[PDB]
UniProtKB/TrEMBL annotation, chain B:
Belongs to the botulism non-toxic nonhemagglutinin family. This is Botulinum neurotoxin type B1, nontoxic-nonhemagglutinin component, NTNH. It comes from Clostridium botulinum (strain Okra / Type B1). The lineage of its organism: Bacteria, Bacillati, Bacillota, Clostridia, Eubacteriales. It comes from the Bacteria.
UniProtKB/TrEMBL annotation, chain E:
Keywords: Plasmid. The chain holds residues 23 to 418 of 626 of the full protein. The lineage of its organism: Bacteria, Bacillati, Bacillota, Clostridia, Eubacteriales. This is Hemagglutinin component HA70. It comes from the Bacteria. The gene is ha70. GO terms for cellular component: extracellular region. The keyword GTP-binding does not apply.
Length: 50, 94, 50, 167, 365
């Protein structure tokens, strides 16, 4: 039963890592896109001021 | 990959381009059809090139006599792909 | 590692990576009492045939 | 003690040099009455590795380059397997023991100051083999000098020196 | 020529030395009592004509004479040992001897010729010399291609006893030394000068041999089937006879030259199916055994044009015939675990079958 307990705990951690990868792929990608667009906006405003 | 047309009240005020990643696109949800294995990878709760010796490799004599294998190459077929471009008309600016 | 990582060579023309065949060359000249027909040098026939 | 001008010299002392304490590390052969024993070898890869004994101011690269430029080149010549062999016929009612060695080529890089040698590096190139044979009786005592060699010696004796700079 | 009109394919024998190719592989110098042994251990030259292209020559040569494309897969070797005199230098150089295949178009009584050269064997020319001695260029150079060995003109125009055996399968060893006709199995001829020795070696190769197989029908007597039957009869496995080797070595007298012709031989196995005194099915399996050697002397100096012999086999070994019955694989075998002492009764559990048994005492039953 202890071995089964440890295996189930490791499986739970595996599912958690899968959800973390889901967050990175589906959610953080959009935030990185926002970061890139914001950097482009900053650079454009700097170019206009210059 | 996409052409965004900001329609006014049907005159295009602005036309912008959104490019693509260039990788293979799949419409099937990978995560919903992927099963996390139980009996596989159920263990294990910066240092990889350590078994390589520069001096030992340098001490090996160069290959002079080569015995050929008849069929060692197959062919080269270049991958030719066509990029599609959709057009999305919107009233709220992007 | 790139230089030393040659693709794995194939076997002999008949298959296998074990010892090759043998061939005897250079019989010694006949003496006054002995034929000396078997006094030769044995060498691996398909040397480095991989 | 030498009679030469001061400077560095590349010296070849010929081949047929047998080393010390390693005579029958390759093993021997015992031949009974009548039969013939052929002991041979094929210098190709691992026994074809030169031995460097360098000194300060004479590293491996220096001595190697000098010996290739002046005398025979061994780095490319050792890739080609060369075979040698000995054949010995035992007597009609006696036993014969023969053992094989390695004969090398002694190369030196000496530094002559005044008329005396003050430095010397050595490079040994595996050249060929050498079979020493004896005819023995059971229980017969054999001289210890037949098997063992205390110091290196040449079994063939030269000293070739080159100063490093009609119709 | 004394031939009818048409096209002919001719083998002029091996031992042809090409012109300007004398010192190409190299030579050896031996001083005093040393023995120099220069040999080889291992591409046809084509010379077409507008009427006969490469494919024509190749197809005709393969059809009639030895298949050189397949023969290039097997290896060959020779030694050509020569000893130096007491006090004089000896120089010996080696060249290749080829086989000259001509294709002639005979009109009336030769208006066309194409030549194919197939590398056969070697030839060593030696001379005894002193320092500063002039040697005539005839020894070093060959202006025209010529034959040194036998001269032949093998041409072809292009266009019972009772057997008291029971019913069942039989395997018959028919002897050793079966070579093929028209020198198809000839591994080659070597010319050895006086005072020298020479040898021809066959190295063999792992799992690389070419047994010959000819069956009445491919339905019941296949190569795999006859191989299994030979294994059952004589324990003949062909993974054998590939690690073996044979070498023919011979020295020449001090007053004449010799020629050594070496062939590859076969051992013949006939797998027959005897039924009511008739051979219903028959297969022939030739296992390459160990070669055959022939020694001849150079003929004195005219030759005749001889037609090729009928395609077949020639036996050069001793007369032999061994007949061994074998168990039919299509019939089951029932084993009697216990022995038979005095009286035994066996119950059949409708097809023919075999019953294996042994008796506990030697006697009549």
């Amino acid at each position: 039963l202890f071995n089964i307990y440890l295996k189930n705990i490791l499986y739970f951690k595996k599912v958690y890592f899968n959800f973390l990868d889901q967050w990175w792929t589906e959610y953080y990608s959009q935030y990185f896109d926002l970061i890139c667009m914001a950097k482009q906006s900053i650079l454009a405003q700097e170019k206009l001021i210059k | 990959e996409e052409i965004i047309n900001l329609l006014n009240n049907n005159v295009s005020l602005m036309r912008s381009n959104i490019y693509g990643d260039g990788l293979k696109s799949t419409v099937d949800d990978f995560y919903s059809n992927y099963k996390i294995p139980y009996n596989r990878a159920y263990e294990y709760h910066d240092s990889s090139l350590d078994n390589v010796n520069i001096g030992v490799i340098d001490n090996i004599p160069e290959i002079i006599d080569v015995n050929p294998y008849k069929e060692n190459c197959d062919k080269f077929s270049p991958v030719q792909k066509i990029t599609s471009t959709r057009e999305i008309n919107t009233n709220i600016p992007w | 590692l790139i230089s030393t990582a040659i693709p794995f060579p194939y076997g002999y023309i008949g298959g296998g990576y074990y010892a090759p065949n043998m061939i005897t060359f250079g019989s010694a000249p006949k003496s006054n009492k002995k034929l000396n027909s078997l006094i030769s040098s044995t060498i691996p026939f398909p040397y480095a045939g991989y | 003690t030498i009679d030469l001008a001061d400077g560095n010299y590349v010296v070849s002392r010929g081949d047929g040099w047998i080393l010390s304490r390693q005579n029958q590390i390759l093993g021997g052969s015992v031949i009974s009455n009548g039969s013939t024993g052929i002991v041979g070898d094929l210098r190709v890869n691992d026994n074809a590795i030169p031995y460097y004994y360098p000194t300060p101011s004479f590293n491996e690269e220096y001595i190697k380059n000098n010996i290739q430029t002046v005398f025979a080149n061994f780095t490319e010549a050792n890739q080609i397997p060369i075979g040698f062999e000995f054949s010995k016929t035992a007597p009609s009612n006696k036993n014969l023991y023969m053992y094989l060695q390695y004969t090398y080529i002694r190369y030196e890089i000496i530094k002559v100051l005044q008329h005396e040698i003050i430095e010397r590096a050595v490079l040994y190139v595996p050249s060929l083999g050498y079979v020493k044979s004896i005819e023995f009786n059971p229980g017969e005592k054999i001289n210890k000098d037949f098997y063992f060699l205390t110091n290196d010696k040449c079994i063939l004796e030269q000293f070739l020196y080159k100063k490093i700079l009609r119709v | 020529i004394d031939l009818a009109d048409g096209n002919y394919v001719v083998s002029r024998g091996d031992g042809w030395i090409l012109s300007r190719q004398n010192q190409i592989l190299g030579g050896s110098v031996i001083s005093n009592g040393s023995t120099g042994i220069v040999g080889d251990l291992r591409i046809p030259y084509y010379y077409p004509t507008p009427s006969f292209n490469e494919e024509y020559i190749k197809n005709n040569i393969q059809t009639v004479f030895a298949n050189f494309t397949e023969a290039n897969q097997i290896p060959i070797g020779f030694e050509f040992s020569k000893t130096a005199p007491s006090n004089k230098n000896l120089y010996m150089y080696l060249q290749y001897t080829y086989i000259r295949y001509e294709i002639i178009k005979v009109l009336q009584h030769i208006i066309e010729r194409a030549v194919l050269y197939v590398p056969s064997l070697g030839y060593v020319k030696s001379i005894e010399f002193n320092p500063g001695e002039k040697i005539n260029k005839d020894f070093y150079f060959l202006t025209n291609d010529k034959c040194i060995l036998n001269e032949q003109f093998l041409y072809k125009k292009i266009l019972q006893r009772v057997l008291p055996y029971s019913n069942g399968l039989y395997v018959i060893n028919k002897g050793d030394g079966y070579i093929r006709t028209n020198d198809k199995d000839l591994i080659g001829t070597l010319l050895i000068e006086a005072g020298s020795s020479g040898s021809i070696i066959q190295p063999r190769l792992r799992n690389t041999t070419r047994p010959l197989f000819t069956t009445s029908n491919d339905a019941k007597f296949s190569q795999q089937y006859t191989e299994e039957r030979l294994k059952d009869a004589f324990n003949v496995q062909l993974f054998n006879t590939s690690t073996s080797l044979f070498k023919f070595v011979e020295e020449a007298p001090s007053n004449k030259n010799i020629c050594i012709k070496a062939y590859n031989t076969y051992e013949k196995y006939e797998l027959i199916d005897y039924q009511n005194g008739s051979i219903v099915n028959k297969a022939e399996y030739y296992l390459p055994s160990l070669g055959y050697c022939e020694v001849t002397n150079a003929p004195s100096p005219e030759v005749v044009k001889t037609q090729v012999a009928e395609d077949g086999f020639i036996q050069n070994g001793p007369e032999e015939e061994i007949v061994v019955g074998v168990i039919d694989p299509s019939e089951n075998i029932q084993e009697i675990n216990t022995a038979i002492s005095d009286n035994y009764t066996y119950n059949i559990p409708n097809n023919p079958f075999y019953i294996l048994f042994t008796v506990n005492t030697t006697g009549i039953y």
